[PDB]
C-alpha cells in the first residue's frame, strides 16, 4: 500500500475533507445527528490545528486514523453532499437529509449502490445543461431535469420511486438522442407531458419565462405544419399561455389535426 508518511498524510487530508463536506452540506449545524456521528473527526477541524499537529495525532493514533473507515465515512457523506448539490435550488427537509444519510450509512457498498448510480445519472443531466445553449432538446432536458430535481428533493433517492425512475429513463434517453432529430425530441417531451399524472407538471417548478419559452417552442414546431391562415392564427392564440398543460397540448393537437384534414 502507501508508504507510512503518505498514509498518515492521507488521514489528515481526509479529516480535512470530511470537515469541509460537513461545512458545505450544513453550514448552520442543522444536521445534529450527522455531526454527532462525525464528532470524532469533526473536532480536529473545529479546533485550529495545523497540518503538522493533526499529522502527529494521526501518527500517534490519537485522532481517528483507520483509512478504510475514514474512506467509508467520507463517502457516505460525499454521496449525501452530491445529492444536496444536484437538487441545487430545490432545498430538502432536514428530516429527509437524515433519512437518506441513514440509508447510505446502512448500505453495503456505496460505490456500487443504485444510490450512487442515480446520483451519477442526475449529474449527467445537470452537467450537460450547465453549458448547453437554448434549443428544443436543451429546453426539454432543462424542464425535465427541473421536475426531476424537485421530485428528488421531495422524495430522496433511496427508494424505487416510479416517477423518478421514469424521469431518469426518459431524460437519459433524450440526452443520448441525436441533436438533429428535432421531431423525436419533441415526440419524447410531449409523450412525457401526456403520460404525466399532473396536468401542469412544470408550474411552480420552472420560472414563468421558461414556461413561456416552452409554449413558444411547442407552437413554433406545430405552426409550420399547418395549411390554413385561420387555423394558424387560432393556434397562435395559444402562444399567450403562461404555463404548459396537457389540455393545451391536446388543443394544439386538435388544431394541427384539423389542418391536416383540410389537406
Amino acid at each position: 500500500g502507501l508508504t507510512s508518511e503518505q498514509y498518515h498524510s492521507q488521514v489528515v487530508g481526509k479529516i480535512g475533507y470530511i470537515a469541509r463536506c460537513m461545512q458545505t452540506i450544513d453550514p448552520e449545524n442543522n444536521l445534529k445527528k450527522i455531526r454527532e456521528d462525525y464528532q470524532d473527526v469533526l473536532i480536529w477541524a473545529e479546533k485550529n490545528y495545523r497540518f503538522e499537529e493533526i499529522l502527529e495525532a494521526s501518527k500517534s493514533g490519537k485522532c481517528p486514523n483507520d483509512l478504510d473507515a475514514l474512506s467509508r465515512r467520507s463517502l457516505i457523506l460525499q454521496e449525501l453532499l452530491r445529492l444536496v448539490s444536484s437538487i441545487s435550488p430545490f432545498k430538502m427537509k432536514l428530516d429527509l437529509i437524515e433519512s437518506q444519510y441513514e440509508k447510505m450509512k446502512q448500505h453495503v457498498n456505496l460505490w456500487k449502490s443504485d444510490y450512487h448510480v442515480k446520483l451519477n445519472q442526475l449529474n449527467q443531466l445537470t452537467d450537460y445543461l450547465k453549458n448547453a445553449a437554448p434549443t428544443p432538446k436543451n429546453n426539454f432536458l432543462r424542464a425535465m431535469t427541473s421536475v426531476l430535481q424537485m421530485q428528488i428533493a421531495q422524495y430522496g433517492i433511496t427508494e424505487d420511486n416510479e416517477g423518478i425512475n421514469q424521469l431518469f429513463k426518459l431524460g437519459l434517453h433524450l440526452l443520448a438522442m441525436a441533436n438533429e432529430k428535432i421531431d423525436e425530441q419533441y415526440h419524447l417531451f410531449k409523450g412525457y407531458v401526456k403520460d404525466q399524472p399532473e396536468e401542469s407538471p412544470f408550474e411552480g417548478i420552472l420560472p414563468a419565462e421558461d414556461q413561456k419559452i416552452l409554449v413558444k417552442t411547442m407552437i413554433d414546431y406545430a405552426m409550420p405544419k399547418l395549411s390554413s391562415k385561420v387555423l394558424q392564427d387560432k393556434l397562435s392564440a395559444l402562444s399567450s399561455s403562461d404555463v404548459l398543460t396537457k389540455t393545451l397540448l391536446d388543443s394544439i393537437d386538435r388544431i394541427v389535426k384539423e389542418n391536416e384534414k383540410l389537406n
Binding site: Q6, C21, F51, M177
Partner: protein, 600 residues
C-alpha cells in the same frame, strides 16, 4: 549547474564536472541540447547515453543537468496531443518550426504555456484548509468531453496558503500555494512525474467491470475488465484496426491513450492520419475522439530511448487520468518493437544477453509494466475510482508464440484476443480466432453478470462448448462425411454455423451493428442457444419413437424461424430501442416455442 563534455564515442558521452549528478537523471548535452541519460557515474564524471545523434558534439561543450529523471509533464493540454516517447510534442514541433524534421535537440515545452485555460477552483477549499496528495483543488474545462481535474502531486501536502480565484490561467501561472512545516510550495496546473515510478493509489481493487468493445465475439466470449490486461497478435491482414478503433470509439473507457513504441514509418502515418477522423456520439452530438485520446506515437528511426520510453510515458499519462478518476484504456501497438528497443539499448550497454538475445530483465519489465494496470481507488480526498486497461499488442514471428516477448506477454496478461489473418481471408470480421483466444476474467465477471445479465453465464458456457464440439465434428466429417452424423450432432453443426455466421460475425461498417450493446448480445445468444436446446430436445425425445425428428424436418418446418434468427443482427440499437429489441427477441422466442411445439 553546468558540466562539460569530456569525451564522445558514438552516443556514449563522458562529462566532467558533474559532481552532484543523479544516476538516471537527464542532461542536455552540447549547444544543441541533445537529450542524454546518465547511465553511470565515476568520481565526479558521468557517462551519458545521448538519445539523439552525437555527430558534432565537441569536448568542452556545456552539459546542462536537468533536475529530474526521464519524466512526463502532466497537465492540461494533453488531450488531442501527439507525443514522441520522450514527451516531445510533434504537433507543436512541426507547427512552430515549419519543417518536416524533428530538429536535433529540439526543446519544445511538452504542454503549451501560451494557451489560456479556464480554471474553476474547488468551491470548498480556502486558505488554511488542509490539502493532501491527490486532492482536486480545481477543474480545468479542457473540452466538452473531458473536464480535466487539477490534482496536487503525490508526495505533496500541507495547508492552503493561496488558491487562485476562478478565471483564465496558463500552465505558467502559480495557481495554488501550500504550506507544510513552515516550508512553502507553489503549484501551477502542470506537474511532473518520472515515467518509471508507479503513481500511487489509495488502494488497488479487483478488476470487476466489463470493458465493452461493442464486438459481440469480444464482449461475450472473451471479456476484458476495466483495469484488466489484454494481448492482440499484430499482423498484416489480421485487422488490429478493428480492436483499436472499437476501443477508441465505442468502449466505455472515459479516456484513450495510444502508444506506437516504434512502428514502421507509414504504419504510424496511418494511425496519425486516421485517429483524428474517428468520431463518437456524446450527448447526441458527433464528437472527435481526439477530444478524449492522446497518442504517444513514434516511428522506428526515432531515438532508441524514445521507443523504449514510449510504453512508460503512455502508462504514466494513463495513470494520471486514472488518478483523476477516469477509466483509461491504453493500447500499445507493438510491445515486440518496444522489446527490440529494449534489446538494442541493452546491447549498446553491452549487458549479458539472456534468452534468445533479449536482456536479462525483459520478463520483469513486462511484468511491472502490465502490473501498473488496474482498477484503483484513487489517491486523495474526493473519493474516486479510475482504471487503466492495457490492451498492448504483441507481434510473434510468423505465429510462433515461443519467443521471449510473446511468451512473457501471454504469461503476464489475462486476456488474449488472437486476431487471425485466416478468418480475415475467409471474410469473417472480426478475425478473432475463438479457439486460441481466451479470457481469464470470467470468474471475476460472474459477479457482475449475476446482477445485470443474470442469464448470460450459462449461454457463455454453452456457446463455447458448442464451438469446441464443432472442432471435433469437423474431423468426424472428414473421416466419414456429413451424412454420417447423428441428428443431434448435425444440429450441433448447423447451430454452430449459425453462431459463426450471425453472432460472432459482425460487419463493422454497417449502421445497425457497428456497435452491439451487451443486452442485444445476450439476447441474440439467448435465442440461438434456446433454438439449440429445442432442436436437441426434439431429436432426443423422439429417438424413442418412430416419428424421429431430423435436421431436415426442423429446417423445412422452421425456415422462417431460422431466417429470423439469422436476421437478429439487423435490429438497430440506434433506432430499435432496448425495449423494442428485447420484445422482438422475445417474440422470436415465442414463435420458436410455438413452432417446436407444433412439430411436437
Amino acid at each position: 549547474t553546468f558540466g562539460y563534455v569530456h569525451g564522445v564515442s558514438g552516443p556514449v558521452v563522458t562529462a566532467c564536472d558533474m559532481a552532484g549528478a543523479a544516476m538516471y537523471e537527464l542532461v542536455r548535452v552540447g549547444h544543441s541540447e541533445l537529450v542524454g541519460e546518465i547511465i553511470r557515474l565515476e568520481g565526479d564524471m558521468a557517462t551519458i547515453q545521448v538519445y539523439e545523434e552525437t555527430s558534432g558534439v565537441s569536448v568542452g561543450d556545456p552539459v546542462l543537468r536537468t533536475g529530474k529523471p526521464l519524466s512526463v509533464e502532466l497537465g492540461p493540454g494533453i488531450m488531442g496531443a501527439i507525443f514522441d516517447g520522450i514527451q516531445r510534442p510533434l504537433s507543436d514541433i512541426s507547427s512552430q518550426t515549419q519543417s518536416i524534421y524533428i530538429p536535433r535537440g529540439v526543446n519544445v515545452s511538452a504542454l503549451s504555456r501560451d494557451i489560456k485555460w479556464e480554471f474553476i477552483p474547488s468551491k470548498n477549499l480556502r486558505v488554511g484548509s488542509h490539502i493532501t496528495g491527490g486532492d482536486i483543488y480545481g477543474i480545468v474545462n479542457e473540452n466538452s468531453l473531458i473536464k480535466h481535474k487539477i490534482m496536487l502531486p503525490p508526495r505533496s501536502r500541507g495547508s492552503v496558503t493561496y488558491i487562485a480565484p476562478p478565471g483564465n490561467y496558463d500552465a505558467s501561472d502559480v495557481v495554488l500555494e501550500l504550506e507544510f512545516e513552515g516550508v512553502k510550495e507553489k503549484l501551477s496546473m502542470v506537474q511532473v512525474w518520472p515515467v518509471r515510478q508507479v503513481r500511487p493509489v489509495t488502494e488497488k481493487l479487483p478488476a470487476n467491470h466489463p470493458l465493452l468493445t461493442g464486438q459481440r465475439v469480444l464482449d461475450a466470449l472473451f471479456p476484458c475488465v476495466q483495469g484488466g490486461t489484454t494481448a492482440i497478435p499484430g499482423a498484416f491482414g489480421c485487422g488490429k484496426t478493428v480492436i483499436s478503433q472499437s476501443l477508441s470509439k465505442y468502449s466505455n473507457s472515459d479516456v484513450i491513450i495510444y502508444v506506437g513504441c516504434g512502428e514502421r514509418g507509414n504504419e504510424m502515418s496511418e494511425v496519425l492520419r486516421d485517429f483524428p477522423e474517428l468520431t463518437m456520439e456524446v450527448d447526441g452530438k458527433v464528437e472527435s475522439i481526439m477530444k478524449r485520446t492522446a497518442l504517444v506515437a513514434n516511428t522506428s528511426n526515432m531515438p532508441v530511448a524514445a521507443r523504449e520510453a514510449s510504453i512508460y510515458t503512455g502508462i504514466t499519462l494513463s495513470e494520471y487520468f486514472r488518478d483523476m478518476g477516469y477509466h483509461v484504456s491504453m493500447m500499445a501497438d507493438s510491445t515486440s518493437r518496444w522489446a527490440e528497443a529494449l534489446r538494442e539499448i541493452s546491447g549498446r550497454l553491452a549487458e549479458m544477453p539472456a534468452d534468445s538475445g533479449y536482456p536479462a530483465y525483459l520478463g520483469a519489465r513486462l511484468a511491472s509494466f502490465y502490473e501498473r494496470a488496474g482498477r484503483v481507488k484513487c489517491l486523495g480526498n474526493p473519493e474516486r475510482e479510475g482504471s487503466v486497461s492495457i490492451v498492448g499488442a504483441v507481434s510473434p514471428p510468423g505465429g510462433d508464440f515461443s519467443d521471449p516477448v510473446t511468451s512473457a506477454t501471454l504469461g503476464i496478461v489475462q486476456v488474449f484476443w488472437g486476431l487471425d489473418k485466416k478468418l480475415a481471408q475467409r471474410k469473417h470480421f472480426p478475425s478473432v480466432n475463438w479457439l486460441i483466444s481466451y479470457s481469464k476474467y470470467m470468474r471475476a465477471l460472474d459477479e457482475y453478470y449475476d446482477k445485470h445479465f443474470t442469464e448470460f453465464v450459462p449461454l457463455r458456457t454453452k456457446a463455447k462448448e458448442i464451438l469446441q464440439e464443432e472442432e471435433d465434428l469437423a474431423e468426424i466429417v472428414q473421416l466419414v462425411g456429413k451424412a454420417s452424423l447423428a441428428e443431434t450432432d448435425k444440429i450441433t453443426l448447423e447451430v454452430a454455423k449459425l453462431i459463426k455466421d450471425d453472432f460472432l460475425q459482425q460487419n463493422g461498417y454497417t449502421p445497425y451493428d457497428r456497435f452491439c450493446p451487451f443486452y442485444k448480445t445476450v439476447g441474440m445468444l439467448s435465442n440461438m442457444i434456446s433454438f439449440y436446446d429445442m432442436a436437441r430436445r426434439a431429436v432426443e425425445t423422439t429417438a424413442q419413437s418412430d416419428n424421429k425428428i431430423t435436421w431436415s424436418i426442423i429446417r423445412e418446418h422452421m425456415g422462417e424461424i431460422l431466417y429470423k434468427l439469422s436476421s437478429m443482427k439487423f435490429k438497430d440499437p440506434v433506432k430499435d430501442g432496448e425495449a423494442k429489441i428485447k420484445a422482438d427477441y422475445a417474440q422470436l422466442l415465442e414463435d420458436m416455442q410455438n413452432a417446436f411445439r407444433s412439430l411436437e
